[PDB]
Paper text:
Titin is a protein expressed in the skeletal and cardiac, or striated, muscle of vertebrates that plays various roles in muscle structure and function. Encoded by the gene TTN, titin spans half a sarcomere (the basic contractile unit of muscle) and has various functions including preventing sarcomere over-extension (Gautel and Djinović-Carugo, 2016), acting as a molecular ruler for thick filament formation and as a hub for numerous signalling molecules (Kruger and Linke, 2011, Linke and Hamdani, 2014). Fn3 domains are only found in the A-band region of titin, where they are arranged with Ig domains in a pattern termed super-repeats, which themselves are repeated. Fn3 domains have a characteristic beta sandwich fold, with a core of hydrophobic residues as the “filling” between two beta sheets that pack against each other face-to-face.
Here, we present the crystal structures of seven human WT titin domains – Fn3-3, Fn3-11, Fn3-20, Fn3-49, Fn3-56, Fn3-85 and Fn3-90 – and two domains harbouring rare missense variants found in patients with HCM: Fn3-3 Arg15908His and Fn3-56 Ser23226Gly. In addition to the WT domains, the structures of Fn3-3 Arg15908His and Fn3-56 Ser23226Gly were determined to a resolution of 2.10 and 1.43 Å, respectively. The two rare missense variants have each been identified in 12 patients of an 874-patient HCM cohort at UCLH, with general population minor allele frequencies (MAFs) of 6.5 × 10-3 and 7.2 × 10-3 for Arg15908His and Ser23226Gly, respectively, suggesting they may play a role in the patients’ disease. There is usually a positively charged residue at the Arg15908 domain position, and the Ser23226 position is also highly conserved. The two variant domains, which each harbour a rare missense variant found in a cohort of HCM patients, closely align with their respective WT domains, with the mutated residue incorporated into the domain without affecting its conformation. Both the Arg15908His variant in Fn3-3, and Ser23226Gly variant in Fn3-56, however, result in the loss of polar contacts, and this is reflected in the loss of thermal stability of the domains. The high melting temperatures for two of the variant domains (66.9 °C for Fn3-3 Arg15908His and 53.4 °C for Fn3-56 Ser23226Gly) suggest that for these it is the former, as previously characterized variants linked to disease via domain instability typically reduce the domain melting temperature to below physiological levels.
Numbering used by the authors: 3 to 105
Write the structure that this text describes.
Amino acid sequence: SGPPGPPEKPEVSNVTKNTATVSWKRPVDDGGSEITGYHVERREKKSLRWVRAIKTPVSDLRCKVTGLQEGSTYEFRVSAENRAGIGPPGEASDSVLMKDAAY
Ligand SMILES: [Cl-]
Ligand SMILES: [Zn+2]
Protein backbone atom coordinates (compact mmCIF):
# COMPACT_ATOMS: atom_id res chain seq x y z
CA SER A 1 0.00 0.00 0.00
CA GLY A 2 1.54 3.21 -1.29
CA PRO A 3 0.61 6.55 -2.83
CA PRO A 4 -2.23 6.96 -5.33
CA GLY A 5 -1.96 6.76 -9.09
CA PRO A 6 -2.43 9.71 -11.41
CA PRO A 7 -5.77 11.48 -11.66
CA GLU A 8 -7.29 11.84 -15.10
CA LYS A 9 -7.08 14.92 -17.34
CA PRO A 10 -8.70 17.94 -15.64
CA GLU A 11 -11.41 20.12 -17.13
CA VAL A 12 -11.21 23.92 -16.99
CA SER A 13 -14.32 26.06 -16.93
CA ASN A 14 -15.80 29.41 -15.92
CA VAL A 15 -12.71 31.26 -17.15
CA THR A 16 -12.43 34.97 -16.32
CA LYS A 17 -9.53 37.40 -16.64
CA ASN A 18 -7.84 36.01 -13.52
CA THR A 19 -9.74 32.93 -12.27
CA ALA A 20 -10.93 29.56 -13.48
CA THR A 21 -12.58 26.42 -12.18
CA VAL A 22 -10.52 23.22 -12.44
CA SER A 23 -12.24 19.88 -11.95
CA TRP A 24 -11.14 16.26 -12.07
CA LYS A 25 -12.06 12.69 -11.15
CA ARG A 26 -10.83 10.49 -8.33
CA PRO A 27 -7.80 8.42 -9.41
CA VAL A 28 -8.72 4.89 -10.35
CA ASP A 29 -5.81 3.62 -8.23
CA ASP A 30 -5.78 4.97 -4.68
CA GLY A 31 -2.77 2.89 -3.69
CA GLY A 32 -4.80 1.02 -1.09
CA SER A 33 -5.88 3.88 1.18
CA GLU A 34 -8.28 6.79 1.20
CA ILE A 35 -7.42 9.88 -0.82
CA THR A 36 -6.95 12.80 1.56
CA GLY A 37 -6.11 15.64 -0.81
CA TYR A 38 -5.24 16.94 -4.25
CA HIS A 39 -2.45 19.23 -5.43
CA VAL A 40 -3.31 21.41 -8.42
CA GLU A 41 -0.47 22.82 -10.50
CA ARG A 42 -0.40 25.24 -13.41
CA ARG A 43 2.00 25.91 -16.27
CA GLU A 44 1.90 28.88 -18.60
CA LYS A 45 1.73 27.84 -22.28
CA LYS A 46 5.16 26.86 -23.69
CA SER A 47 6.87 27.48 -20.35
CA LEU A 48 8.60 24.49 -18.75
CA ARG A 49 8.00 24.64 -14.98
CA TRP A 50 4.85 23.47 -13.20
CA VAL A 51 3.98 25.61 -10.19
CA ARG A 52 1.49 25.42 -7.35
CA ALA A 53 -1.89 26.80 -8.41
CA ILE A 54 -3.54 26.62 -4.96
CA LYS A 55 -2.00 27.43 -1.59
CA THR A 56 -2.79 24.08 0.09
CA PRO A 57 -4.40 20.85 -1.11
CA VAL A 58 -8.15 20.50 -1.53
CA SER A 59 -10.22 17.42 -0.70
CA ASP A 60 -13.08 18.05 -3.15
CA LEU A 61 -12.69 17.20 -6.85
CA ARG A 62 -12.65 20.79 -8.02
CA CYS A 63 -11.46 24.21 -7.04
CA LYS A 64 -11.56 27.84 -8.07
CA VAL A 65 -8.00 28.82 -9.03
CA THR A 66 -7.14 32.47 -8.57
CA GLY A 67 -4.13 34.69 -9.05
CA LEU A 68 -3.85 33.99 -12.77
CA GLN A 69 -2.39 36.70 -14.99
CA GLU A 70 -4.80 38.35 -17.40
CA GLY A 71 -3.73 37.71 -20.98
CA SER A 72 -1.71 34.58 -20.14
CA THR A 73 -2.47 31.03 -21.28
CA TYR A 74 -2.36 28.19 -18.79
CA GLU A 75 -2.72 24.44 -18.46
CA PHE A 76 -3.38 22.60 -15.20
CA ARG A 77 -2.68 19.17 -13.74
CA VAL A 78 -3.66 17.33 -10.56
CA SER A 79 -1.84 14.98 -8.18
CA ALA A 80 -3.52 12.95 -5.45
CA GLU A 81 -2.24 12.12 -1.99
CA ASN A 82 -3.10 9.62 0.71
CA ARG A 83 -1.51 8.67 4.03
CA ALA A 84 1.53 7.25 2.21
CA GLY A 85 2.12 10.51 0.32
CA ILE A 86 1.70 12.07 -3.12
CA GLY A 87 1.29 10.14 -6.35
CA PRO A 88 2.44 11.12 -9.83
CA PRO A 89 0.75 14.05 -11.54
CA GLY A 90 -1.87 13.42 -14.16
CA GLU A 91 -1.78 14.81 -17.65
CA ALA A 92 -2.28 18.46 -18.45
CA SER A 93 -5.65 19.95 -19.18
CA ASP A 94 -6.32 21.73 -22.40
CA SER A 95 -4.94 25.25 -22.30
CA VAL A 96 -7.13 28.29 -21.61
CA LEU A 97 -6.53 31.98 -22.30
CA MET A 98 -7.32 34.28 -19.37
CA LYS A 99 -9.71 36.97 -20.54
CA ASP A 100 -12.97 38.40 -19.26
CA ALA A 101 -15.75 36.96 -21.39
CA ALA A 102 -17.47 39.34 -23.80
CA TYR A 103 -21.18 40.20 -23.64
CL1 LIG B 1 -14.56 10.34 -9.65
ZN1 LIG C 1 0.67 17.08 -0.38
